Amino acid sequence: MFEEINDFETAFKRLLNEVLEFDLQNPLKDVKKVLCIEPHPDDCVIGMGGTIKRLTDRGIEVIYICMTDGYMGTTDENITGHELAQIRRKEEEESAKMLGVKKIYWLNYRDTELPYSREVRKDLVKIIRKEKPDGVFLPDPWLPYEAHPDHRATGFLALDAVAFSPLPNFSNIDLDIGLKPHSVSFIGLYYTSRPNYFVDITDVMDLKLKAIRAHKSQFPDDIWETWEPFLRTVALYYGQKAGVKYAEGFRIMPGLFYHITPFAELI
Amino acid sequence: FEEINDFETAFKRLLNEVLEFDLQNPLKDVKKVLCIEPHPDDCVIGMGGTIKRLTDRGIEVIYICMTDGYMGTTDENITGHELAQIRRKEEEESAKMLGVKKIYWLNYRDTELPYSREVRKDLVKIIRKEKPDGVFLPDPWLPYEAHPDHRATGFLALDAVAFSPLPNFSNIDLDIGLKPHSVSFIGLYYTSRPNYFVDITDVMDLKLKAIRAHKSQFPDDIWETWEPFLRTVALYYGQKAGVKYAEGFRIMPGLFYHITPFAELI
Amino acid sequence: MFEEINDFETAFKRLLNEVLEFDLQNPLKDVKKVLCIEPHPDDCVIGMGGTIKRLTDRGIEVIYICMTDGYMGTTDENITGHELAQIRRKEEEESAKMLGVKKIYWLNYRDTELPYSREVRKDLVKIIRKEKPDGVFLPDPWLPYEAHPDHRATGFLALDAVAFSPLPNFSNIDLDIGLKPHSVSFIGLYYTSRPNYFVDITDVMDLKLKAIRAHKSQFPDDIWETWEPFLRTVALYYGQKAGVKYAEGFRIMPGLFYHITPFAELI
Amino acid sequence: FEEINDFETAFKRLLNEVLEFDLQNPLKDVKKVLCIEPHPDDCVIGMGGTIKRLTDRGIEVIYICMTDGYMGTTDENITGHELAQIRRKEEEESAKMLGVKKIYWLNYRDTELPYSREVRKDLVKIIRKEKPDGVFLPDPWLPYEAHPDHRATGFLALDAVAFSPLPNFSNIDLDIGLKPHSVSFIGLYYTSRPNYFVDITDVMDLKLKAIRAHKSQFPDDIWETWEPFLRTVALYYGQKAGVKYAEGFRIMPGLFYHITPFAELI
Amino acid sequence: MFEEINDFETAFKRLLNEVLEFDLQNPLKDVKKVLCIEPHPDDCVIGMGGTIKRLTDRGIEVIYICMTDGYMGTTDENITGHELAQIRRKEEEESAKMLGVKKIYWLNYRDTELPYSREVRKDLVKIIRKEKPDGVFLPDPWLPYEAHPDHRATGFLALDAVAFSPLPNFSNIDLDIGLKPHSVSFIGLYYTSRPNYFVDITDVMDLKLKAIRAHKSQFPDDIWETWEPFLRTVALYYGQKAGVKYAEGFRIMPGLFYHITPFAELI
Amino acid sequence: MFEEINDFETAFKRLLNEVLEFDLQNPLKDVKKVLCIEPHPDDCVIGMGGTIKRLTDRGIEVIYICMTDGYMGTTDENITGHELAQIRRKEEEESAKMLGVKKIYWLNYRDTELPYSREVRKDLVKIIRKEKPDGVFLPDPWLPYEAHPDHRATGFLALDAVAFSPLPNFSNIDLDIGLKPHSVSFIGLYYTSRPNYFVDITDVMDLKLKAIRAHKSQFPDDIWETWEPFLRTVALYYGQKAGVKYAEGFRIMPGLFYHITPFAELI
Ligand SMILES: [Zn+2]
Ligand SMILES: [Zn+2]
Ligand SMILES: [Zn+2]
Ligand SMILES: [Zn+2]
Ligand SMILES: [Zn+2]
Ligand SMILES: [Zn+2]
Ligand SMILES: [Zn+2]
Ligand SMILES: [Zn+2]
Ligand SMILES: [Zn+2]
Ligand SMILES: [Zn+2]
Ligand SMILES: [Zn+2]
Ligand SMILES: [Zn+2]
């Protein structure tokens, strides 16, 4: 009957609800395993640490992929990048335990030098095909005024990896050695300015801040004077829109809307 | 112009009198246009209705296809080389149904279209040879466009248009006897900020047949989702144009693609 | 506290005013030396030439960095790119004298071929660490409909250079030969469509246009017929928002807002 | 070793007692080998006779083909995608005639095989999965070799062998449950400094049939030149081996591919 | 026939003489048009200037392809690379007139930054397909102890261009706009240490040295003190092997011997 | 008088001895400061450790440049690359003290991923211009059967850096921040198969082996069973040619012979 619809608003509701079976009310329905893709050690916990704790509490398996080693993130002239990499691995392991996270994949690209290349797509696809996750969380590459190249590259690479994982001609040696081409059901953008889904983290906010603080190298007492207020202000910003004190915002869309969809921004 | 102190007046004066910019009939004196598609099918899905309307009015429409479409199957039994051959026949078939006779294949692999000087030169070489009056290309600023080939194609196409008239750009082209060429017209399809509309209500059924010609891409089960999707897109452009089904284009003066802070105000 | 606040609007005002000590009213307070980063010879003067004259008059040292040689910017079949590069160096030297500008750094990347690479980041960091400037002006890489690759690359590279200059592990050979990490106090985006700060250039507009016209290769009489009205229309656009006739618009944000800040666009 | 003061003595002692290097029977403990070919046909042209002799003695021989062979025709009617499909069937046919069952296709385009970390990882992934005892690869030091794919394949293959055993190299391979692997044997084919020879006089006619299986590459007119060429190569290795027709290999200890100034002395 | 040969030496003589019809005595039999590919302005004249004069005298059309602009080749702190490029264009034009050379193609890659890429192969193939030359002269990329990256890249790129020009699937847009595949009959390597063919240049040596000296920027009086003796010593080295005073050495092989030929070094 | 020589052998002797003033008998005459360029931590000491001790004993300043971090060089699954980098820095510092070496520059490129790029050339040129060394030692990039990409790249990059350091248009920002072009007097290739100069290390051989063994991560007891005999066999190979027990072999040529010299291999 779709041929004889003459109003956009009607066709849109019909496309989302009946054709795509898209659900914003409970979009995590049948997800048991999710990947969180972080550009740097700490990005997962700062972006969506509260939501990760809430997920592992409900018995959802949450696995980290860390794109970089975090080699550059110190102003101390006494800490070489190799020293800092070891330090931030221990820190992210510690931070991961406090939320329910057991498994981390390290790609080991150098901080500030994450290529936007076919090579990094293949590395991510290899992990998606092995772990066969139901959902993937990744930073929104369209975050206005995001100046960090690793953040822009990670978001775009992660969306490519999700879209190309189910194509048997993409990185075909993966299938030849016995991995299978996998479709992810769910995509969530964190660190986003246009969220359409909210998780209340008011009850776990104190644990989130403790798990951020586990990154001692990144949050000495002097830096923390600025960041505790910043992180609370972010949590309030998502909070206003969710009708709670403290929240984490996600943008969830159907796979289809990430390609040639001029009304994609209308959810 | 020295004596104007209000922006709104200077803006109307710049568009109307200085630039002589015309949204009412922007295809006035265009006889030949290039449609630049990242993949086989992108031209017909994006602006197939408009292409039929153009070739009917006797305008020559030439495709440039950036990639071979090697990756676009979930069938483990179709190699990329097999699929490339298949999608060439499909786009040839789809092209005949609209009035399109000439296709240039650059043969970059699907998902691996470089954003490089090299692909700019390939496009400039075609622009200088064919001397087209207008170029259609996908809007690289489409919100939430995740396909790298789509982003790269839009940016590369705008670069090619801007650099084709510069004799120092790809100078070997001139040494073997091509000439610099200036394009009159730029149109962005697959856009979320269109400012010009073509009614395709009368040709919508032909457009869908010409999309369906890409059998590899639209089996019956996929088509269950895509017919409604493509109709919903056509309705979205429709609402803004005051018809049922439309294709949206963004048209701006060449000048507004560079250091223009009010570019989004047309 | 900050724990006690449960309204976003309050936390936001508190974060800007008290935590970050951000001041839009006089943001150039303690800046004595600034770098202006231009993709092409002429971009500084066209973008913010009026502001540069006002700065050098008040005794602020303004230093240009030019990313490219301007090799491609002619339609004359008789002028090779090497010829035009020499010509536009003389032109930018001439244009620079008319405003108060004495020092220009030429990176000498070819027009239309400015890489977005670690290599160009190092080149810019080397200059920032040597000159120890208090502020940096650079083109807004998020300018809607900016099709020139050199403009997009320059803005992103400049923000990276500013962010990485203070990191001792970034381009470590710089410190080994006796340069020091440097933190830039001030970042200003010119050629922007979301300006939040304005400089009146009504009094110096005629000098700005003379200094643009000094680029003879780029502004013959026929081209100038279009560009004088264009440049006046731009100056009026910033003008309306500033409550003057002719202005230059800048976007100024705290350094923190260029990373994972979902309300960045809300100043 | 401390109290040796003559090079010639220390050299014999290093090879025989320390490294336990054996040129007389170097395939002692090899059950599985990879043959790495830049193009479809390179394995059979380079060492087809040796491959037949190996599979007859029950050794598993697995091909890795780096490229699709997209460029290797002067026929204006055959697109590269068409030719790729054709040369896959041809190499499958040629592979059956020798004892070869498994081919891995990397699907890099002919003439565009990068010398990159990315292609190293692709090869390491296969070496770690298949755990082969030996690897055959084209000698990248072949004088006057003009083909970039041949130079890149040889260097990449030696890198892959050297880096496969390092757990920090392509660490995601181990995280998903592959293991580091050390290859026991390295053989260079298409070499001008061979130190080991296989008699192929008895299987020469089968080798030529298996080369000819690549019809796209060896029409009757091309074959007029190549049968004599391939015979002349086989005679060149022959003279040095004391038979009519041979295939020459260079075998060295893994150690001699790094900072060994007397490497050329075996 | 060839099946019943049991001697390498016999099959080798038979392959060269009868099958390949290879002729070292007069290898320039049917060549009317040749390309000389030089990495830098001056490389053609220094390498084979004498041979070029002897060729243009006999009415052979000799066309230069210059890969780079020669931007880096001065120790003078006052001469920008753009200045030097203009200067070395005039110099090579002057040097070219003195030998019989009328047409030079400038690719305009920067000195020291000549990529070994598909892109430069396409540029060279485009010229080979347009000019349809019978022969190509290029520097021997296997020259022992050649440290200049532009020299190594030029030799390899030139051999690739020759090998790929006849393949319709290589740079297919060239054919779509109406160029045709072209097969080059003749390949000569200059600047080679394993030459197998010699041209007597004793009678034109003084003109060669004048045409080298035309590159004033490259050969001031002090540099020339070293280079006149060097260039004479090179000419004597080729001379001894040719049985004359002064010669230019070339390596000529069948096209076949540049691919999987283990006895290639045996001519 | 060079015009009226008619024999190569005579011109060759005359060019080396009188024109170039090339001296193999005492080639380190006026060198007080040398750079040793090593691809990996340990390459300097394994290649020419004995010669380094003999140089620092005579009061010559020897400065290391290490291209890579040595991240990949372990088969232990429990040592991350970041851990191993820290470990091999301490090891090379220890090994350096035992020979007379005080100063090491770390470029910090990852083991196995040393680019052959303009970027690494600039890094090396920056150090050559700052330290103004009289000589440079680097691994022979033409070593037959060298399979390590870092070894091939280091040798070529080092020769480029030496050749481009004196060109003011190469890496021009170096001069703008106050470094000067520098000419290196001396180039020595170690890890070479065609040496023409030898240093007796018989008396310091057991110190060299101790300084190699300082790299504990690289030489456990089991690995050392193979390498002590290997390193002794190498030292004997150079030994035979020098008429001593244990030696280190170097190739020294005039700078001129690294460009378009067909008789380069004839010294
Ligand atoms: Zn981060
Ligand atoms: Zn597409
Ligand atoms: Zn035209
Ligand atoms: Zn500009
Ligand atoms: Zn400072
Ligand atoms: Zn091949
Ligand atoms: Zn194993
Ligand atoms: Zn040169
Ligand atoms: Zn032809
Ligand atoms: Zn004089
Ligand atoms: Zn090493
Ligand atoms: Zn100096």
Coordinates of N, CA, C and O in Angstrom, one line a residue, chain C residues 18-95:
Chain C
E18 N 34.0 30.5 36.3 CA 34.8 30.3 37.6 C 35.9 29.2 37.3 O 37.1 29.4 37.7
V19 N 35.6 28.1 36.6 CA 36.5 27.0 36.4 C 37.5 27.3 35.3 O 38.7 27.1 35.5
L20 N 37.0 27.7 34.2 CA 37.8 27.9 32.9 C 38.3 29.4 32.8 O 39.3 29.6 32.2
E21 N 37.6 30.3 33.5 CA 38.0 31.7 33.6 C 38.0 32.3 32.1 O 39.0 32.9 31.7
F22 N 36.9 31.9 31.4 CA 36.8 32.3 30.0 C 36.2 33.7 29.9 O 35.2 33.9 30.5
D23 N 36.7 34.5 29.0 CA 36.4 36.0 28.9 C 36.3 36.3 27.4 O 37.3 36.5 26.7
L24 N 35.0 36.5 26.9 CA 34.8 36.9 25.5 C 34.9 38.4 25.4 O 35.1 38.9 24.2
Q25 N 34.7 39.2 26.4 CA 34.7 40.7 26.4 C 36.1 41.2 26.0 O 36.1 42.0 25.0
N26 N 37.1 40.8 26.7 CA 38.5 41.1 26.2 C 39.4 39.8 26.2 O 40.1 39.6 27.1
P27 N 39.3 39.0 25.2 CA 40.0 37.7 25.1 C 41.5 37.8 24.7 O 42.1 36.8 24.8
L28 N 41.9 39.0 24.3 CA 43.3 39.2 23.9 C 44.1 39.9 25.0 O 45.2 40.4 24.7
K29 N 43.6 39.8 26.2 CA 44.2 40.5 27.4 C 45.7 40.5 27.3 O 46.3 41.6 27.1
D30 N 46.3 39.4 27.5 CA 47.8 39.3 27.8 C 48.5 38.7 26.6 O 49.6 38.0 26.9
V31 N 48.0 38.9 25.4 CA 48.7 38.3 24.2 C 49.5 39.5 23.6 O 49.0 40.5 23.3
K32 N 50.8 39.3 23.5 CA 51.8 40.2 22.9 C 52.4 39.7 21.6 O 52.7 40.5 20.7
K33 N 52.4 38.4 21.4 CA 52.8 37.7 20.1 C 51.8 36.7 19.7 O 51.4 35.9 20.5
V34 N 51.3 36.8 18.4 CA 50.4 35.9 17.8 C 50.9 35.4 16.4 O 51.5 36.1 15.7
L35 N 50.6 34.1 16.1 CA 50.8 33.5 14.8 C 49.4 33.5 14.0 O 48.4 33.1 14.6
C36 N 49.5 34.0 12.8 CA 48.4 33.9 11.8 C 48.7 32.8 10.8 O 49.8 33.0 10.1
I37 N 48.0 31.7 10.8 CA 48.3 30.5 9.9 C 47.3 30.7 8.7 O 46.1 30.8 8.9
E38 N 47.9 30.8 7.5 CA 47.2 31.0 6.2 C 47.5 29.8 5.3 O 48.7 29.4 5.2
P39 N 46.5 29.2 4.7 CA 46.7 28.1 3.7 C 47.5 28.6 2.5 O 48.4 27.9 2.0
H40 N 47.1 29.8 2.0 CA 47.7 30.4 0.7 C 48.1 31.8 1.0 O 47.6 32.5 1.9
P41 N 49.1 32.3 0.2 CA 49.5 33.8 0.3 C 48.2 34.6 -0.1 O 47.7 34.4 -1.2
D42 N 47.7 35.4 0.9 CA 46.6 36.3 0.8 C 45.5 35.9 1.8 O 44.6 36.8 2.0
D43 N 45.5 34.7 2.4 CA 44.4 34.2 3.2 C 44.3 35.0 4.5 O 43.2 35.3 4.9
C44 N 45.5 35.4 5.1 CA 45.5 36.1 6.3 C 44.8 37.5 6.1 O 44.0 37.9 7.0
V45 N 45.2 38.2 5.1 CA 44.8 39.6 4.8 C 43.3 39.6 4.5 O 42.6 40.5 4.9
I46 N 42.8 38.6 3.7 CA 41.4 38.5 3.2 C 40.5 38.2 4.4 O 39.4 38.6 4.5
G47 N 41.1 37.3 5.3 CA 40.3 36.7 6.4 C 40.2 37.7 7.6 O 39.1 37.9 8.1
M48 N 41.4 38.3 7.9 CA 41.5 39.1 9.2 C 42.5 40.2 9.0 O 43.1 40.5 10.0
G49 N 42.7 40.7 7.8 CA 43.7 41.8 7.6 C 43.4 43.1 8.4 O 44.4 43.6 9.0
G50 N 42.2 43.5 8.5 CA 41.8 44.6 9.4 C 42.2 44.5 10.8 O 42.8 45.4 11.4
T51 N 41.9 43.3 11.4 CA 42.3 42.9 12.8 C 43.8 42.9 12.9 O 44.2 43.4 14.0
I52 N 44.5 42.5 11.9 CA 46.0 42.4 12.0 C 46.6 43.8 12.1 O 47.5 44.0 12.9
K53 N 46.0 44.8 11.3 CA 46.5 46.2 11.3 C 46.2 46.8 12.7 O 47.1 47.4 13.3
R54 N 45.0 46.5 13.3 CA 44.6 47.0 14.6 C 45.5 46.4 15.7 O 45.9 47.2 16.6
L55 N 45.9 45.2 15.5 CA 46.8 44.5 16.5 C 48.2 45.1 16.4 O 48.8 45.4 17.5
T56 N 48.8 45.3 15.2 CA 50.2 45.8 15.1 C 50.3 47.2 15.5 O 51.4 47.6 16.0
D57 N 49.3 48.0 15.3 CA 49.1 49.4 15.7 C 49.3 49.4 17.3 O 50.0 50.3 17.8
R58 N 48.6 48.5 18.0 CA 48.6 48.5 19.5 C 49.9 47.8 20.0 O 50.0 47.5 21.2
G59 N 50.9 47.5 19.0 CA 52.2 47.0 19.4 C 52.3 45.5 19.6 O 53.3 45.0 20.1
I60 N 51.3 44.7 19.2 CA 51.3 43.2 19.2 C 52.1 42.7 18.0 O 51.8 43.2 16.9
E61 N 53.0 41.8 18.2 CA 53.9 41.2 17.1 C 53.0 40.1 16.4 O 52.5 39.2 17.2
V62 N 52.8 40.3 15.1 CA 51.9 39.4 14.3 C 52.9 38.7 13.3 O 53.5 39.5 12.5
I63 N 53.0 37.4 13.4 CA 53.9 36.6 12.5 C 53.0 35.7 11.6 O 52.2 35.0 12.2
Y64 N 53.2 35.7 10.3 CA 52.5 34.8 9.4 C 53.2 33.4 9.3 O 54.5 33.4 9.3
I65 N 52.4 32.3 9.2 CA 52.9 31.0 8.7 C 52.0 30.8 7.4 O 50.8 30.8 7.5
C66 N 52.7 30.6 6.3 CA 52.1 30.3 5.0 C 52.3 28.8 4.7 O 53.5 28.4 4.6
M67 N 51.3 28.0 4.6 CA 51.4 26.6 4.4 C 51.9 26.2 3.0 O 52.7 25.4 2.9
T68 N 51.4 27.0 2.0 CA 51.6 26.6 0.6 C 52.3 27.8 -0.2 O 52.4 28.9 0.4
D69 N 52.8 27.5 -1.4 CA 53.5 28.4 -2.3 C 52.6 29.2 -3.2 O 53.0 30.2 -3.8
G70 N 51.3 28.8 -3.3 CA 50.3 29.4 -4.2 C 50.6 29.2 -5.7 O 50.1 30.0 -6.5
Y71 N 51.2 28.1 -6.0 CA 51.7 27.6 -7.3 C 50.6 27.5 -8.4 O 50.9 27.7 -9.6
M72 N 49.4 27.2 -8.0 CA 48.3 26.9 -8.9 C 47.4 28.1 -9.3 O 46.7 28.0 -10.3
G73 N 47.4 29.1 -8.5 CA 46.4 30.2 -8.5 C 46.6 31.3 -9.7 O 46.7 32.5 -9.4
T74 N 46.6 30.8 -10.9 CA 46.5 31.6 -12.1 C 45.9 30.8 -13.3 O 46.0 29.6 -13.3
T75 N 45.2 31.5 -14.2 CA 44.6 31.0 -15.4 C 45.4 31.3 -16.6 O 45.0 31.0 -17.7
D76 N 46.5 32.0 -16.4 CA 47.4 32.4 -17.5 C 48.3 31.2 -17.9 O 49.1 30.7 -17.1
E77 N 48.2 30.7 -19.2 CA 49.0 29.6 -19.7 C 50.5 29.9 -19.8 O 51.3 29.0 -20.0
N78 N 50.9 31.2 -19.6 CA 52.3 31.6 -19.8 C 53.1 31.7 -18.5 O 54.3 31.8 -18.5
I79 N 52.4 31.7 -17.4 CA 53.0 31.7 -16.0 C 53.1 30.3 -15.4 O 52.1 29.8 -15.0
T80 N 54.3 29.7 -15.4 CA 54.6 28.4 -14.7 C 54.3 28.6 -13.2 O 54.3 29.8 -12.8
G81 N 54.1 27.6 -12.5 CA 53.8 27.6 -11.0 C 55.0 28.2 -10.3 O 54.8 28.9 -9.3
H82 N 56.2 27.8 -10.7 CA 57.5 28.4 -10.1 C 57.5 29.9 -10.2 O 57.9 30.6 -9.3
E83 N 57.2 30.4 -11.4 CA 57.2 31.9 -11.7 C 56.2 32.5 -10.7 O 56.5 33.4 -10.0
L84 N 55.0 31.9 -10.6 CA 53.9 32.5 -9.8 C 54.2 32.5 -8.3 O 53.8 33.4 -7.6
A85 N 54.9 31.4 -7.8 CA 55.3 31.3 -6.4 C 56.2 32.5 -6.1 O 55.8 33.2 -5.1
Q86 N 57.3 32.8 -6.8 CA 58.1 34.0 -6.7 C 57.3 35.3 -6.6 O 57.5 36.1 -5.7
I87 N 56.3 35.4 -7.5 CA 55.5 36.6 -7.7 C 54.7 36.8 -6.4 O 54.6 37.9 -5.9
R88 N 54.1 35.7 -5.9 CA 53.1 35.8 -4.7 C 53.9 35.9 -3.4 O 53.3 36.4 -2.4
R89 N 55.2 35.5 -3.4 CA 56.1 35.8 -2.2 C 56.2 37.3 -2.1 O 56.0 37.9 -1.1
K90 N 56.6 38.0 -3.3 CA 56.8 39.5 -3.3 C 55.5 40.1 -2.9 O 55.5 41.0 -2.1
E91 N 54.4 39.6 -3.4 CA 53.0 40.2 -3.2 C 52.7 40.1 -1.7 O 52.4 41.2 -1.1
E92 N 52.9 39.0 -1.0 CA 52.6 38.8 0.4 C 53.5 39.6 1.3 O 53.1 40.2 2.3
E93 N 54.8 39.7 0.9 CA 55.8 40.6 1.6 C 55.3 42.1 1.5 O 55.2 42.7 2.6
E94 N 54.8 42.5 0.4 CA 54.3 43.9 0.1 C 53.0 44.1 1.0 O 53.0 45.0 1.8
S95 N 52.1 43.2 0.9 CA 50.8 43.2 1.6 C 51.1 43.2 3.1 O 50.3 43.8 3.9

